[PDB]
Structure 1
Amino acid sequence: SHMWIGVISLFPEMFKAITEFGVTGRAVKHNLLKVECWNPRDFTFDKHKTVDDRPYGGGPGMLMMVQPLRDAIHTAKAAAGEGAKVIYLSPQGRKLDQGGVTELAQNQKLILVCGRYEGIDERLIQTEIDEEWSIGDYVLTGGELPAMTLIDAVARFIPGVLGDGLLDCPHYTRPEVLEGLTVPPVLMSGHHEEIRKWRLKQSLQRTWLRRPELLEGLALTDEQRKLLKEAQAEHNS
């Protein structure tokens, strides 16, 4: 179930951050994940390899120049063959969450278009882009970090890359006592069922306290309902 991701970027060397390091670097070396980049600058024809252009209507910014970007996209589409979804990363896109990650991970091929400057021509979005996605409600200097974020997130779903809507439970490792703070005795008990229930209760409690809206989106099991009620009762002393 390997995955191919084509990238359109003025700064393809940025993607070394995910292709050369850690779990995603291993995925690439083991051919579980392939990331292939095209740079609009390589598709320019003028002496100074111009990749930006002035916005109609004026304004302080520049846009990506249409012809080099369009040609790079077309080249990526030809390399991908049939079935590749083309994604543009921008704050105007659908907000990414883990459900959206699972949806995107169903694709065997993606092409990610990374904007720079003030963005890209709206008509390219209409004619070349299948979906717009955002990694969050904030503005960055380029689409490369959003693209890498998406790649990393979906790569976790590729079989072989790694070894319920709630926040994670607390985790502990050595030493047993750290600046006077002890490990919860249950985690030392060797009682697997008690440990499982403790972790679940902690996850429910943390989700309730920090992100209560996330709970509203869940259909809690009988056990989860019980443990959440216990946690809420204890919180209220």
Structure 2
Amino acid sequence: GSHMWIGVISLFPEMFKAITEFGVTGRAVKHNLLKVECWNPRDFTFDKHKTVDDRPYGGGPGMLMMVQPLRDAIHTAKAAAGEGAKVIYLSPQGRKLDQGGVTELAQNQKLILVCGRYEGIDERLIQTEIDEEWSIGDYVLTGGELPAMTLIDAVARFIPGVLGDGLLDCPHYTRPEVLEGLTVPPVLMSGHHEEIRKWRLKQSLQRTWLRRPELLEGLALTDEQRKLLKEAQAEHN
């Protein structure tokens, strides 16, 4: 119902087939719940070799994205989007993406994602063309395409019809009942939905505490969560 439009600026638009042609996101595109539209800076060049990079002022080992083709591609995308479109640049210098951030971005009906290549883009373009800068993680990649697709996949899950709480997920079990000597926890076989809910919640609480203690600090646990966590920490001791 509340479909989403995402414009993409990229030198390798065919990379985005990975999300538009496969799985849940592929279905979302086919069903017109999500639309991904790509513009290639190479198409906006004029020199006879279609040059899309340029030398950095001050010297340096690498190259930067050439301003004019990239600038023109962005302007074209903005015009196609109309008013309301938020322009986002993916880079390690951006705001750290988390699920809260995903929910925020997902409120936007229109996004334009600029995918950097080489050593990046001109700083003045960030000032004049980019509304927000985001990062998917503290690591370095060869291009902004994978971060853009990661963002798209993340926000797509919030679009109505695409699918079917601060804690890590509980463990999951399926057939067979015994796998290499390891049995399914009896509570999951019991058929008692309330016990199953509490066990799963307790497991999530235990796993978050053991693996990601800092995530617990940012939460105000319910009475039930405080109790189950206490139980888990007592059993762990």
Scaled by the length of structure 2, the TM-score of the pair is 1.00
Runs of 4+ more than 2 Å apart: none
What displacement does 1:164 show?
A: 0.6
What displacement does 1:108 show?
A: 0.1
What displacement does 1:208 show?
A: 0.1
What displacement does 1:214 show?
A: 0.0
1:176 and 2:185 equivalent?
A: no
1:127 corresponds to which residue? 128
C-alpha distance after superposition, 1:131-176 (max 9, x if no partner): 0000000000000000000000000000000011000000000000
For residues 61 and 195 of structure 2, what CA distance do their matches in structure 1 show?
61
For residues 115 and 7 of structure 1, what CA distance do their matches in structure 2 show?
11
What displacement does 1:85 show?
A: 0.1
C-alpha distance after superposition, 1:68-118 (max 9, x if no partner): 000000000000000000000000000000000000000000000000000
1:228 and 2:229 equivalent?
A: yes
For residues 196 and 47 of structure 1, what CA distance do their matches in structure 2 show?
65
Instruction: Give the secondary-structure state (helix, strand or coil) at the position aligned to 2:107.
Output: coil
For residues 3 and 35 of structure 2, what CA distance do their matches in structure 1 show?
8
Instruction: Give the secondary-structure state (helix, strand or coil) at the position aligned to 1:91.
Output: strand
For residues 68 and 43 of structure 1, what CA distance do their matches in structure 2 show?
5
What displacement does 1:38 show?
A: 0.0
Residue ranges of structure 2 left out of the alignment (5+ in a row): none
C-alpha distance after superposition, 1:171-215 (max 9, x if no partner): 000000000000000000000000000000000000000000000
For residues 53 and 95 of structure 2, what CA distance do their matches in structure 1 show?
26
For residues 140 and 232 of structure 2, what CA distance do their matches in structure 1 show?
38
What displacement does 1:127 show?
A: 0.1
1:39-188 to structure 2, matched below 5 A, reads 39-188=40-189
C-alpha distance after superposition, 1:35-58 (max 9, x if no partner): 000000000000100000000000
Q: How large is the RMSD of aligned CA atoms in angstroms?
A: 0.2
For residues 163 and 99 of structure 1, what CA distance do their matches in structure 2 show?
21
Residue ranges of structure 1 left out of the alignment (5+ in a row): none
Instruction: Give the secondary-structure state (helix, strand or coil) at the position aligned to 1:230.
Output: helix
For residues 61 and 192 of structure 1, what CA distance do their matches in structure 2 show?
59
For residues 226 and 64 of structure 2, what CA distance do their matches in structure 1 show?
52
